[PDB]
Design a protein around this ligand. Structure first.
Ligand SMILES: *[C@@H]1O[C@H](CO)[C@@H](O)[C@H](O)[C@H]1NC(C)=O
Ligand SMILES: CS[C@@H]1[C@@H](N)[C@@H](O)[C@@H](O)[C@H]1O
Ligand SMILES: [Zn+2]
Length: 1014
């Protein structure tokens, strides 16, 4: 295994180093506004060295944006695809590329057999070529790598089954900034090439000058280069026609033949296209070849890529004809005029890359190596696209909840083959497709119109219901005596209970377990642990009595703690945000212990008085002029007091001190260590009154944030043996800090209400001497070093926080893990900040045509980990990566893949069993089984199960930790007949494995395996 910490890769372009050196000046470069006047030597190309030009027709189809997926399919995409089939069928030389398989699958299943055969034929013959082949062209900032893989696999599996092709070239022309998580996943899925477009205009200028727009993109920690993927970055401001033929859009616009009038499009540079004729073809060719030779100067080979397309293009039959015929006249003239020394033709993306690599092999060019990312994107001036790292945060959190539910439903049901009548495959396909659809660059990004966000939400809601159904049917089968098991596939044996989604104050959706001496004395509950190691986690349920005790299935008592059910309300009468305690239901908390990738059953039993193994939390309401808070049957009385500073310690854990405002002030790791200053503060950013305004994409603050005026907030302290917490009602946020013995958990119920032009940020102030350095993650996969640059505006120093961020100095580190992607930064030494929500009354001029005024309450979750790191083996000062400690990685897993909770729905569960998975190996803590998926239906003689294994890299800080089992996924199911290593999409076998044993993977590597069973 390659060492991912100690060896700094040597690459030609390292983006953090490039950023440090670049000036970022925004000067007028002439017709190429963000570049310069390109010059070329006319004698560079000659009879023996011609410029080969591939014009690649394309149509960008968003699976939701200004319209929903179904509306665009009906109004535009079904017509684009129908006319592409007709025109390519009838014109053998025409070519077209297609990226979004969600739309293609939607179209193809509606075709009659004759058209299906014609479509398969134009794909097999090379006229229609799929690029990437994912369900969508995903966002690359907020998406979790697991869901980027999920959507890629969904579209590619559809393509292999129905079109018999697997793309090896990727096309990503619209995501707003680009992540190296894409070449990481693509290179492990069979890809050989990829293309990107939206990168900072200063980066396009810098790389163009050095002819570094084509490069071998490797991961930041990859010293050898085995992760490298050839990448082509487009050079100009847009992928539309005006910005794809060359540096001068006033000339290129004249070669978009859809802009002459009858289509309602025109050229903003004031010169329209004109039909190509024998009388003007020479002058037009002179102009066009000149743009092509200028564009060719920015690259190293004699093979030139000219995309020809835009959004929802190639719709009208007349549009196909006007583009095809005018370009064929230009090609016939250019190709026949020897003095141009050009050979131009329609082509596909693969054809372009194949030609480039043939030139490389002929020794005509060598390409630079590059590592890093392409965030944060700006398309012009100071317009940095950091707003969408936070826009529509409710759905960004929903994305992560569904991410986990899909994983759990696929894993729980993978253990057995199911009868078709159980509709397991059907429900899982729907869940995977709706989550895949939401990875679109206008889905999770929060950049769609209001009614479209509504459509994505409704789809995800159904996806969660489908997961619940599969999970609960699986638990009943996994824990019921086989000879007693008698399923009704439509019945609900268990209901899922989720403490953090939609969350308290967001939706009262949680059921109360109703017990009573005269009705039902006890209830079975079951926890699932999707991770491959034994795991303990406190779990909570709502119960109708405070007098409840817990036992495991050996009837062994389990220590529990009971607390009140607290809800916060804005009292429009008193004008205070204060908690109300339930007088009809309570919370029981206990530690569940669950096997690796398994299940554990516990029982809740009611009694008439305090049970021996159940304790009760004390409660203290701090506020001036308090009023009583009765708690129905709850034993202990609530106490009151004026606001004051407070300290709490659960177990052996850290001791947290809080201000009289209920916000963290310090953390003391051990009883004798110092109280390290760690202060939570909430502030707000506004919007500019003159000049460009923030919108769904853009973050354009009117200066540094200002403190939220807190007044005298109401603070609630609940102190328990197992769990304690301090909650405070602040304007727009009920902020809660929970302690269970280790790193605290933070929960924010964010309701921005009607505060227009406001962005609420949560900041952490410390005295850590981080300087201008901080770390953020990319897609939940890796942590990358960031350097705050005062030469760039505040919004440029904002980065995606898809799962976590940290700052450190030589001795101390503070890491904030998230249960949802949000935007954040470190704008001064010792600070961390992350945006909670943003409400914007104006549009930001990118075409969305609306502000963001559809905010809804969302519960954001976090883990805050303060730790000493003077003893950790960290990368050197020049290394571009960072790595989490064991505690921080487990803290991240607790937010993203918590234990799942099931409540038996009937009175009695006959045949109940206590545990499932006790014999599963408990793998090393840095290893995860990211995906477990049965790939075959029940009628298959040979069953196949696929696994994606991922190993992260954790810092070595002096903790021995050495007692775990080797995990061989191929032997998790019995009767294994074969084990193969495959691409990550499971579509190609790469290695027949000896002994039918699946090796574990190296730190930072991800592998896939498929076991076959007879
Ligand atoms: C699928 O594609 C491969 C590669 O061209 C071809 O050999 C095969 O015959 C095609 N059809 C089948 C059998 O799926
Ligand atoms: C140019 S804005 C961008 C448009 N290109 C459209 O495809 C959609 O994804 C939107 O967010
Ligand atoms: Zn788009």
């Amino acid at each position: 295994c390659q060492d991912v910490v100690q060896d700094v890769p040597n690459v030609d372009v390292q983006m953090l180093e490039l950023y440090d050196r670049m000036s970022f000046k925004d000067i007028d470069g002439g017709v190429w506004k963000q570049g310069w006047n390109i010059k070329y030597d006319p004698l560079k190309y000659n009879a023996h060295h011609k410029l080969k030009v591939f014009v690649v027709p394309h149509s960008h189809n968003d699976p939701g944006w200004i319209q929903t997926f179904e509306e665009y399919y009906q109004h535009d995409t079904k017509h684009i695809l129908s006319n592409a089939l007709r025109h390519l069928h009838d014109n053998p030389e025409m070519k077209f590329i297609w990226a979004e398989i969600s739309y293609f699958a939607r179209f193809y299943h509606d075709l009659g057999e004759n058209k299906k055969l014609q479509m398969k034929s134009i794909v097999k013959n090379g006229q229609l070529e799929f690029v990437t082949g994912g369900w969508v062209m995903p966002d690359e900032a907020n998406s979790h790598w697991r869901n980027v893989l999920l959507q890629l696999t969904e579209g590619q599996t559809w393509l292999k089954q129905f079109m018999n092709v697997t793309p090896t070239a990727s096309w990503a022309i619209d995501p707003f900034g680009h992540s190296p998580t894409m070449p990481y996943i693509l290179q492990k899925s069979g890809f050989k090439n990829m293309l990107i477009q939206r990168t900072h205009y200063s980066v396009k200028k810098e790389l163009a000058q050095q002819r570094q727009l084509e490069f071998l993109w490797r991961q930041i920690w990859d010293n050898k280069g085995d992760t490298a993927l050839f990448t082509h970055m487009m050079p100009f401001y847009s992928y539309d026609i005006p910005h794809t033929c060359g540096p001068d859009p006033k000339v290129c616009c004249q070669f978009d033949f859809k802009r002459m009038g009858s289509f309602g499009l025109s050229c903003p540079w004031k010169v329209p296209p004109r039909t190509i004729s024998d009388q003007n073809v020479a002058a037009r060719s002179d102009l066009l070849v000149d743009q092509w030779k200028k564009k060719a100067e920015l690259y190293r080979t004699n093979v030139l890529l000219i995309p020809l397309g835009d959004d929802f293009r190639f719709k009208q039959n007349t549009e196909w004809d006007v583009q095809r015929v005018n370009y064929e006249r230009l090609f016939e003239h250019i190709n026949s005029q020897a003095h141009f020394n050009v050979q131009a033709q329609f082509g596909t993306l693969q054809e372009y890359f194949d030609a480039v690599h043939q030139a490389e092999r002929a020794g005509q060019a060598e390409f630079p190596t590059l590592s890093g990312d392409f965030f944060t994107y700006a398309d012009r001036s100071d317009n940095y696209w950091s707003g969408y790292y936070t826009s529509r945060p409710y759905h960004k959190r929903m994305d992560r909840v569904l991410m986990h539910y899909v994983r759990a439903a696929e894993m729980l049901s993978a253990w057995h083959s199911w009868d078709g009548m159980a509709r397991i495959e059907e429900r899982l396909e729907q869940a995977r497709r709706e989550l895949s659809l939401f990875q679109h660059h206008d889905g999770i990004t929060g950049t769609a119109k209001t009614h479209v966000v509504v459509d994505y939400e409704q789809r995800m809601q159904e996806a969660l219901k489908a997961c619940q159904m599969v999970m609960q049917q699986s638990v009943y089968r996994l824990l019921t005596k086989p000879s007693i098991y008698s399923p009704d596939f439509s019945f609900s044996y268990f209901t899922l209970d989720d403490s953090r989604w939609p969350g308290s104050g967001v939706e009262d959706s949680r059921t109360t377990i109703i017990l009573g001496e005269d009705i039902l004395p006890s209830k079975h509950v079951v926890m699932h642990n999707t991770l491959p190691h034994w795991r303990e986690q406190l779990v909570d349920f709502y119960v109708s009595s405070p007098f409840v005790s817990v036992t495991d299935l050996a009837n062994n008592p389990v220590e529990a703690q009971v607390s009140p059910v607290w809800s916060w309300h804005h009292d429009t009468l008193t004008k205070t945000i204060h908690p109300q305690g339930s007088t009809t239901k309570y919370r029981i908390i206990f530690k569940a212990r669950v096997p690796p990738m398994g299940l554990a059953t516990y029982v809740l039993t009611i009694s008439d008085s305090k049970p021996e193994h159940t304790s009760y939390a004390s409660n203290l309401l701090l506020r001036k002029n308090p009023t009583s808070l009765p708690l129905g049957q709850y034993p202990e009385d609530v106490k009151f007091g004026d606001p004051r500073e407070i300290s709490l310690r659960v177990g052996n854990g850290p001791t947290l001190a809080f201000s009289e405002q209920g916000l963290l002030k310090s953390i003391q790791l051990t009883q004798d260590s110092p109280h390290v200053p760690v202060h939570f503060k909430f502030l707000k950013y506004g919007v500019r009154s003159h000049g460009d305004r923030s919108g769904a994409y853009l973050f354009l603050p009117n200066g540094p944030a200002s403190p939220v005026e807190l007044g005298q907030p109401v603070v609630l302290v609940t102190k328990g043996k197992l769990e304690s917490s301090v909650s405070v009602g602040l304007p727009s946020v009920v902020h809660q800090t929970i302690m269970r013995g280790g790193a605290p958990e933070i929960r924010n119920l964010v309701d921005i209400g009607s505060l227009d032009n406001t962005e609420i940020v949560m900041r952490l102030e410390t005295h850590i001497d981080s300087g201008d350095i901080f770390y953020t993650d990319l897609n939940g996969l890796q942590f990358i070093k960031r350097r705050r640059l005062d030469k760039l505006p505040l919004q440029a120093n904002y980065y995606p926080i898809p799962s976590g961020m940290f700052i450190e100095d030589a001795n101390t580190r503070l890491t904030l893990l998230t249960g949802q992607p949000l935007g954040g930064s470190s704008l001064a030494s010792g600070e961390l900040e992350i945006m909670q929500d943003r409400r914007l009354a104006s549009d930001d001029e990118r075409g969305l045509g609306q502000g963001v005024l559809d905010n809804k309450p969302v519960l954001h979750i976090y883990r805050l980990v303060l730790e000493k790191v003077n003893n950790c083996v960290r990368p050197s000062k020049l290394h571009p990566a960072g790595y989490l400690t064991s505690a921080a990685h487990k803290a991240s897993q607790s937010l993203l893949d918590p234990l799942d909770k099931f409540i038996f729905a009937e009175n009695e569960w006959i045949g109940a069993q206590g545990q499932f998975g006790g014999d599963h190996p408990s793998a090393r803590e840095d290893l995860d089984v990211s995906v477990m998926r049965r790939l075959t239906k029940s009628s298959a003689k040979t069953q196949r199960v696929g696994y994606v294994l991922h190993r992260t890299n954790l810092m070595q800080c002096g903790t021995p930790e050495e007692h775990t089992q080797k995990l061989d996924v191929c032997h998790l199911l019995p009767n294994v007949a074969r084990c193969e290593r495959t691409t990550l999409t499971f579509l190609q076998n790469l290695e027949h494995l000896d002994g039918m044993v699946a090796p574990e993977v190296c730190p930072m590597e991800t592998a896939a395996y498929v076991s076959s069973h007879s």
